[PDB]
């Protein structure tokens, strides 16, 4: 799938054993995220940073 970088302006495809995109938010997810990348499986959600996975292009 095609995932975006920090800003939802630049994004590409994540073939490297990746078919999902994720975004990590600080404290809360409601607010803007802090980092994001591609992944094959949703990682463990932390209490410090909120984990949000998706399978849609430009989801992050």
From Swiss-Prot:
UniProt cross-references to SUPFAM superfamilies, sorted A to Z: Snake toxin-like (SSF57302)
Gene Ontology MF, one: toxin activity
Subcellular localization(s) per the UniProt record: Secreted; Target cell membrane
GO BP annotations, alphabetical order: killing of cells of another organism
Tissue specificity as recorded in UniProt: Expressed by the venom gland.
Cysteines paired by S-S bonds: 3-21, 14-38, 42-53, 54-59
CDD domains, A to Z: TFP_snake_toxin
Signal peptide boundaries: none
Principal place of residence: secreted
Matching Pfam families: Toxin_cobra-type
Alphabetically ordered keywords of this record: Cardiotoxin, Cytolysis, Disulfide bond, Membrane, Secreted, Target cell membrane, Target membrane, Toxin
GO cellular component assignments: extracellular region; membrane; other organism cell membrane
Keyword Disulfide bond: yes
Gene3D superfamilies on file: CD59
Family membership noted in the UniProt record: Belongs to the three-finger toxin family. Short-chain subfamily. Type IA cytotoxin sub-subfamily.
Assembly notes: Monomer in solution; Homodimer and oligomer in the presence of negatively charged lipids forming a pore with a size ranging between 20 and 30 Angstroms.
Function per UniProt: This three-finger cytotoxin is a basic protein that interacts and penetrates into the cell membrane, with the tips of all the three loops. Cytotoxins which have a 'Pro-30' (P-type) interacts with membrane stronger that those which have a Ser-28 (S-type). CTI interacts with membrane weaker than CTII.
The protein's name in its UniProt record: Cytotoxin 1
């Amino acid at each position: 799938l095609k995932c975006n970088k920090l800003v939802p302006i630049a994004y590409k495809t994540c073939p490297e054993g990746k078919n999902l995109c994720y975004k990590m938010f600080m404290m809360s997810d409601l607010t803007i995220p802090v980092k994001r990348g591609c992944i094959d499986v949703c990682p463990k959600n932390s209490l410090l940073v909120k984990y949000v996975c998706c399978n849609t292009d430009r989801c992050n």
